[model samples]
Target chain A: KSRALQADIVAVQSQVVYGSVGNSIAVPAIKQNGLNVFAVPTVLLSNTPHYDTFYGGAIPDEWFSGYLRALQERDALRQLRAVTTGYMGTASQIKILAEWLTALRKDHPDLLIMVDPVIGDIDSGIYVKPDLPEAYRQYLLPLAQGITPNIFELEILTGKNCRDLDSAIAAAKSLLSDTLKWVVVTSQEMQVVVVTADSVNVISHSRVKTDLKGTGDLFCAQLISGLLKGKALTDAVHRAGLRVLEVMRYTQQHESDELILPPL
Target chain B: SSLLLFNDKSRALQADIVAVQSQVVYGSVGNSIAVPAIKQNGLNVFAVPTVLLSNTPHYDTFYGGAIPDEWFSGYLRALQERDALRQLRAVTTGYMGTASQIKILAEWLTALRKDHPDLLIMVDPVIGDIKPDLPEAYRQYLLPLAQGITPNIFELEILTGKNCRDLDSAIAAAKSLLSDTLKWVVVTSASGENQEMQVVVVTADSVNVISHSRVKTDLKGTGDLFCAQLISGLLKGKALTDAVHRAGLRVLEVMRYTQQHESDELILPPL
Candidate 1:
């Protein structure tokens, strides 16, 4: 039997105990936006690896898959307008996730599935397993409606040039298909590119210098929550863009490495 | 070795309070309610989950249990490592899975207090509800370490071993908990269908009552939500009395939202 839906969306991501990344920050960020979320952790860490040391590890594969199935069996998706993911632990998690999403798609055809291809950034090369990129392409893209990847991840995912704005825009557009409605590229030359089949738009904001991680993850939360609140795609991206800037300002002026989300 | 923390007193901390509590995957309880409600009010909560459960046991079946004992302490230990405790204004604990967790937290609090003497500590003694018995560890070790506490009427009875069926008794019972170190005791969730719903706040010198009209609910996390709201107000510099008012009003809104939307869980209203 299906349970009464409590969450407007589900955020499947890494959950750090100490820092503002993954579900640790996403659940609060989205909730403050006037929506409810269920945090499903792919991995649990003490802090982002941007530091010297951290504890915790990926959720065991069986438990990860079991967790997802439990949510489904409990029918958590009846009012679930969107499902977003970030910083996956293994390609194996993707395999089970893809299979689960296949069924969810068939049952709830109108669901919004977004994937943040969190592989690596400019400072660090791919930290995930070697097979994760291909697994994302083969398994997740076909089922998801949107993806938010840094330009580095865009280059890695498409094997296309993303160093330049024009090619980055083309690379994002080239990945769009019937199932994938939007490709949002972030922090490419200090600009955010939003690409769909019919339109390619750019959202630019002043860059702020901060050593904090999870701005991208928090951006995904803002975009997902904005969309869940019935915002237009471009508007949602823009909302997330400004929010990122606002929080970055908080991070900088506050002189803290952790993200300090603005009050609701 | 820990990072040599330099408190730039001029710069603000990333978080206002460290909310150490349970975190549920499905139900709206523990950190799920605490972190969001606090952050919604413009304060950051450094959440440390003491337990990871499927739901609050209101469901027919639930999965998961206490986080491994070491991991629970590791989560708290890492905050200090990351220098997250330097400017932390307060911390509140809720729905602990085991007495070991409370004992570990008490040890941490001892060290934290030695370092930051002015830090406010609020303990939401989450007994008499989800947990049927108050772990002696809380009464003997944790409660004394806390400067503030939020206990329900039943918890006041248990803590004092006195009858708290009514306000006069509750006030006396809650007052009995106050000490030189333990100053403010908030006795909450005084609920009845045909009777009034009241939250009694006991300071070292006085007792005050705030009442909210209760709505019928079988959902979980109402007390956790109240705890978070109260902590949020305290971190924002609201007096203990005002914090009780803010928390009572907010929990009422959440209860009303749950009924209005026909949702089975406590639903947080939009700002």
Candidate 2:
């Protein structure tokens, strides 16, 4: 049982903060569960802004650099124990954000960079232009220490191509390599592998649903917070997954158009 | 074998001078742009900057500071002792902080060459990017010791005071600066005659030209990375052409990633 949920990927609201999730329902879920969050926006987006053509909404690296610089100057950087980053709209942001992470690592040795490896989609067919994955592989992944990728993201990150459980485990271990400690692959056979020098944990669960959007964002945030507090990997996953599944059932039982119930 | 010992106690950083091409940053048509393509393919990379900032070439005020000479010398000695020059296959020199430092480094390299008689010496001859804006003292010091000089059209023009449009003529003029002791004289970033690839004219072999797509983002350190990696890759058994090709691809990858992922930041490898 891991902290699991059901949700969609993208949503545009009025005047979206360049690097923030405004109506992020999962934000509350993560906060309530006890994980601190630091979000970096790859691109500023407008609500349902015609995905067909070039979107006018834009937020570049300089803006986020200033924000992060302010945080560093405020001595707030030392307070950040763990960082989770997502959704890179440009290859440059990957490098810009990575430089900050690299700088932070010098001081915060224990700090873990948990990359969701958010880029492109299955149906969208390579949303992020090109050469983005090379950036992710060379710069971002080496810093990760830990990673959570969907089925599609995993294949791209690991250069793996397969459809079976053994293949998934093999792929997970290969991706874990030496840099990252934990590898979680959420696919048809939801497998969790906690890779360590001493041992390894490869566990799988049944396929929950095909189109759970906000599930990964919430899972990464909550699991990271829980692990930081000294919870065992298996126990944390079990508890978080159970919570998410229950919430999903409750939301499903309520029979609403959205993934979850209304705000409390 | 050349050791440019920089002795600046006041400065914060240090670097080892491991042969560089096109010293300063500029945006002229022929001035070489060190793209990401060169970085990924090259070998042996240790970049100790004379300045520090996230941005370079494009955006000023990103962060700028000078490196002390003592620190640079220390690294040079460290690398030399680590990879004993007596066993070194080749030794190249390019770019120095000050004219006095250039003289000092040039002398050191000359001594190293004498000590290691068989060692090859290649020089990018980067006193300035295009024009001779470098301190008069440095120009006086660096020109005499260049064994194999690689400079762009503008640099060649400044060094020779001649119209350097033809590849053969340019190579001839660049070769005049070298003594008979020099073996390989390459003219880098030359564009003409179909404009397909940049030429690297060697002494004995056929003309070598490298072609790559020009990248948009012009961050600092790409040049350093490219030069260092090229020498390293070449020494590591990669053919010069293959090394150039690979290094260009790697650096381009780095730039594309840096531009797409970073905003005012230089994209460096994670490790």
Candidate 3:
């Protein structure tokens, strides 16, 4: 009905044809919360890595950056209230995105940058190149206003074991700086911790047994959406946690591997 | 709390829609227009872009190019492998950039329909009125597969090789294009002798004509939006004639909104 009134979010992520990871999950999740998404895909894969044989590959950096530059030229970036990113396919793409984010932040000083450093998980360790995490630490993390990382990512980034709630809080707080405002450290079993400069809030929810791909991406989107609606850091973290828990319960009950996100 | 409660409620029902069209960064034209409109109607869109552009060709400066055939087929293969094909309820297409691409799509549609015999395929044969000849491949492979088609008066003329000088002629042209597979043909924007614009919807059983005063300015995506709403209505179980009527009214509403707001692009109606 009121399409003109929709808010815009810039989502830079990988896109898979099969599953709800990267922009596939983020775009609809953000839009369902009443925001329009401008998705910039880094890689276009047939499916996620869980599939034995997937087709397609990363979009060349030139084409990927070309789309971004086109959006910039059109002044589409001006309408962006938030930018959430995940799963960079190449290190060069990360550099291009970092430069773009810096330029955008200069123009829109208050733009929220939520970085989901999709490096790896506990079971698989680092799926991406070993150097990609360093690139994120150097170029991306400093620009981000918010970061959503699981316990494994938190441990990798901060060089601290996030095995429990207290350790997770400490690890999350270790990554915060003057520009990086908040960190939500998520774990499959324990409470989630929202770490800030002066505070640490733990949000506990009943855990579903299954761990699905793209839950962190969904969490980041909902968290940003809540913040855009003027919720405080702790409240946004709590809301995102609750929403992911609800979705995960559905996925578990249905015995599905993909995150069965709520329809828009 | 009320807001939280609203978010917590079970999601609204939505049908699975596969939309193959063009995508642009700056303005809504093909997939940009169709995807959101279908989404607003409580349907999910699995968007497949044939071409990507910075804006509609009306602008002199733009960027991007057509998606390669390899990636396009890869996407389809992935969806099939994931069993997403079973979830497909309807397929809508617009703006094929190449005849070869059309052939690939035609083959895929044939296979898809074989699996889901009841699949509703809406084809907006986008060979514009300004063009001289509609592609033979499109006529040869695509039209015979369509369940419904929304074409402007000029396109209707091109498709049926008949001059649609008035509403009756346009209705005859639309009816001529229909076969056992192609059931609905909506010839949009037919100018009558009295200057009232007539929307002629022709089916095997009925000929429905809805007239409204023409909006002088040229608008893009009106046809795409109309097709999206019509499909949405049909998927939701509305009768054919009623769906056509609803689509026309919705398009008129969007046009009026755009006119009042002095906006170039067509906006989707309020949720």
Candidate 4:
């Protein structure tokens, strides 16, 4: 039997009960942009890891597989126009996800998977498993249609210095190819740099000093939602950058580590 | 700490709702339907799934099972430990699977209401229309705790133990269902003398009846959507009758869209 078609976007990310991060941030952000999000949580936490005390952990591999199998059997995966992946549990999980994405792309070759490699940031060096960066480079990055990586992740992925906008643009270009069409490197105090094979685009906003979580997650969500809505690559990146800046301004004004997302 | 105060005050303006219901992986029913509608209106949702299924049971192939009561309670405990429950403005429930789960939820509601005295509770009793009796446990444990309930005409008949043969009888049955605590009863799918579909809103001071032409298709999730919208409207300061009217109108709009498009389920438009 045919069901009503939903504008489906699959998001594999972490879920926090109290604060915004991973699927908690991305799912609602994308949903607000008028898409139906099929959320597969990688982990479930009481709050973001920034908090001193938190509960919950990674979803078991077996349960994750079972959840996916159910959706596949229901033919729910076929309706997906895009898939966005964020925080993951382990390198082993990434390997399995790589194979899964490869197999899925064989049938739906046009599927856009936006991979936000949640490896590390400037302040916290390598928060995920030490081996995860290699796994992301080997398995996840190659299959990505677009990637939003911060400066630290760019340095790890391509071993290029990203202290300035020009270096960040050059480093982003090193990851782009026919398969990976767009790379947005969020770096520096005042700019968000986007690099494609054809050109380089930069979006600048006044920087705020507050340390807010989930801005990257929010940006990736907005970018994917914009792309799925038929926006040009640069325009999508520009829109995503401005939105993150707006949320960060709100976050800074409130002086909260948590990202206070406004109503859509 | 002025910034902290600002953060707390700003977030308090956006209400949080704890939605306890079923979650379908594909179809929009129960929590799957309610959570999105709740979020679209700028509310935060703490979704606790009573049952997990591949799709609505009307479909041929599906998977998943009811969450055991222990795990259900554990999830709520985790939220409570983090003080998330203290921030709740309302709680909405739909399609609970077991009596034990209802007992646990009822206790939770009682405890939560003790702390947040003005806590709004909206319950959509999901007892089957063709069933003979309302689950005794639901009537005993849930109804008394609810501030508002959205029950279809069949469910209302079972709740009040009186057949609603006409609009007046329906109104009387609905008023009889209301208690000192249970104030709002929205009797959906009641019929008017002219064969139009009627929705009766019965409260302490007012009884308003809304009627419209019936749609032929029987799509799922209408009650879920209406209840979610009604909770949102009420929390946003709309009066009982106004919230009931707005919720019914939105449900009808989606149903009309589904029929015009020949869709199997309600496909809600964006926020």
Candidate 5:
């Protein structure tokens, strides 16, 4: 599916599949990029939650925590170079994940955690709760090596003006340092900008007007895969963003959702 | 093609594009500008006019009628026939007129069941006026079909013949009968066990609660928009509790924006 494995990476996803968003896309993307991917599914979503008022499935915390402990027992912690995480279902889960990542860092001393800090959008403002942003910033951000914030999330995290992409990127980049490596701002005005302590780069795609949900999650997974593949942070961000946009555009062109991520 | 409804005279009037765009005030039934908002927000609208201001009449309410089910089902069938049933996820229903329309939607939902067995069906349960006024058939037809529903405390009392005093009873009393099909319920109101107001989500797995400081403002379509934002949040992989909380926050923001000035319909924040 990809060029041979050059590095080892693990991906975490929200376990829901329909029209490709969340963990369903992330798991496949990680595996496709020639990385040894270990998946810890937090929630089982019955498709995208666009249709009806329905039920949901959850992976018990005991099982979730046990997976990491199993990895610990096998001394597999040393093999993981980078870790990608998305869609935490609860504040408690957020705390648990942070603790897990902390254990990984303590055990491996170099395991990089890339968190797609998904809370609420600028328009949706603190949808999860008032305390969630605080949890992400105070506890979680310090642990993360990289984060991809949408314009709204940047403003919420840094308490900066996110009315436009420029200010949003500025705020997001301000959160970055030697420790917090990359801050990729997704779904910006036109350009998807990846910012770091070193520099910033804007990635673009041919504009397609239809609203395609979950494209951001796909982009983050692909970019993280690229990072594991040894691409420069900016290069990884651009490729991942472009790759996802191209897939969506390809689907749009053919009136199809059949095209999967890491499109061949 | 545009017809304006005069609030004072209840009369029909002509309007140009600029007039229509500027004049509809908030999105409304049968308004062309409202069409874009519906498509943009991502739902098929079954435009039911409460007051008809037309030149001709067929049979009182039949002066003009629009069936949104055709477009909705057309979307589902189009996707199914093309092996795109996966794209066909989640349906948000609001503001329908008459019992037959509800039956049409319910039957179509039943039909789509064969293909989209996992489809999420959310009903705002737009049956009566938000303030206790109702058209008897709303309870007769719509209440039974909802899998997950959002209703006010008053609506809860009307539908169940029980007043919810505490959080536990409210959730149980407002339970979706077709629990096998749907199991989530949210009741929004001023009174609840928590301080201020609460947005309660009763899902199959667990009951989730989101509490917010109740703001004072009168705005139209805030509930509808809140429902839209909530559905969008859930669709984005947020937990049911988080989705309800997000919807509450969005609604507050919209209400505050409207309170800043004078308007019935506040422009929703861009997703």
Candidate 6:
């Protein structure tokens, strides 16, 4: 065997120094499930917004653009099987990312693109730039094979009643596409609804009511890790659910404020 | 259930360590390797990137460089202001871009230690092989502050202004750097013969050398990987000698992966 420097997936997301959101949790989760991840930072922030004050900001357009290009130039991108996008700090990056992925797929046509659509949550309404939600729906969605949007983001994208499980299923179904194979809606009212082009699977959840962050980011990471490990879509979702809940339980039980990742 | 029972007060730490190093979008070096290295040991790293390069400069060209001075200092200060350091166990400084950044770090840690005396400062002292007027800056600013220092043979020579191309001198050089504050000095590649590398670990009173046959592979991040795992071991309550042994063992495994896979990058093993 030889050195296979290429990562299994390229995680384009926010990277904070003191928080467990974005690639902070994604890289570890992906590797914990036995895969290599080349983490690309959209925002190099100090901590999550939960902190009173933090430092740093989104990487500049040129830096962010150059970071992705280095992967291909170094011949690290061709072998990549997936590209996952999460929390973006700047709206300007939408264009760069869209263009890059479009070019990337020309060679890697079978690449799995999973977009987390990190526009907002119920607690913080529209936390990102004003134009981001629409930008995510219009530009990013067509290219993505799967999406993990919360009930809040699902409601925003579909503009339908997602008050309950059946309604949430209907909303996610409307957003399904030929290229987009599955839509996983998390942070629901005690359930996770997975809507594919033809079927819907609802997995019951044991919600831990505590002030913890990055569970959604952690969920998408675990799901991608499962997918890369060749698990079925619904099975992957189930695995992610169990893993994330375990992390939640460990964090709460240990009384640690930050997300403590438990073993797989 | 009372104080009479002699209970250990330590529980789970919130943020275990602050990993200050270079971060490349492509390679396994600096915070990229350190983040995963420590996290596997159930430690949370407040990873601060000193530079944002495209990859390790192993290739002909790379992109990105040092973050601006204001942003660098602002990033560190923000951690304090955010109150994120309350339960931090250690701070590992590795592969910084400039001497000024280390200068900035030294000043910051000086003030930080006054308030948080329990915080361990692990300095990798990535100098001429890597800083801008760094040799003196490291000695003047950081050498005194470090609880542990991981330097290579070249760095040991540079730090002490002596030849360390052999074992005895290297051990002497490592011992020369030890102090009450600086408890451990691990000088790697201090001696080599018959295709073997001797890693000299120095405490205040003793020096123990660990030698192993070198893994023949041209890969970056080996040094960072060693320091990263060492920090992990210390954070996980490994004794001083055990921590070095564990770190050295990890470097071998990572080197083996790079060799066997012939990967363009260093392939880190999952713990």
Better of 2 and 6 by DockQ: 6
Model 6 residue runs over 4 Å out of place are A77-79, A121-124, A158-171, A186-188, A202-209, B1-16, B35-46, B68-71, B74-89, B115-120, B130-132, B157-180, B183-216, B229-250, B269-271
lDDT of 1 by residue, A133-216 (tens): 988989987888999988889998899979998899889888888888999988623688899999988888777566778888
Q: What is the DockQ of candidate 2?
A: 0.02
RMSD of 4: 5.3
DockQ, all candidates in order: 0.30, 0.02, 0.24, 0.22, 0.01, 0.46
TM-score of each: 0.79, 0.42, 0.84, 0.76, 0.48, 0.83
Q: How well is candidate 5 docked (DockQ)?
A: 0.01
Docking level for model 4? incorrect
Give the candidates in order of TM-score, highest first: 3, 6, 1, 4, 5, 2
Model 2 per-residue lDDT tens digits across residues B1-271: 2232462221111112244222211111111222222223332122322322222334333322233455344434443433323235554554444554555555666666665565555555554542234545435655665545556666677777777677677767766665666545555562432333365555544456666655444355554445555555656678766766766666566556666664233344532
Fraction of true A-B contacts recovered by candidate 2: 0.00
True contacts kept of 5: 0.00
| Candidate 3 runs further than 4 Å off | A1-8, A16-18, A32-36, A52-56, A77-79, A129-131, A155-174, A251-264, B1-16, B85-89, B129-134, B160-176, B190-197, B204-206, B217-219
Model 5 chain A: worst 10 consecutive residues (lDDT sum)? A1-10
Residue lDDT tens for model 5, A1-264? 211112366566565323456755675666677665555655544345554321244445554565444444434444578877777666656677788888778766778788888787756476553556777887788988989877788877898887777787678778987679878776623667778776777777666565555676778778878877789788787778677777777666665433444344
Chain A TM per prediction: 0.94, 0.76, 0.90, 0.92, 0.86, 0.94
Residue A8's lDDT within candidate 5 is 62
Q: What tens digits encode model 6's per-residue C-alpha lDDT throughout B74-94?
A: 788877775666667788999
What stretches of model 2 exceed 4 Å from their correct place?
A1-23, A46-58, A120-125, A188-200, A206-212, A254-256, A259-264, B1-271
lDDT of each: 0.80, 0.50, 0.77, 0.77, 0.58, 0.81
Residue by residue across A126-145, what tens digits does model 2's lDDT show?
65647678788888898887
Q: lDDT tens digits, residues B216-246, model 4? A: 5557888898888999888878888888888
lDDT of 6 at A104: 90
| Sort by DockQ, top down from the best | 6, 1, 3, 4, 2, 5
- Two-way lDDT contest, 1 vs 5, winner: 1
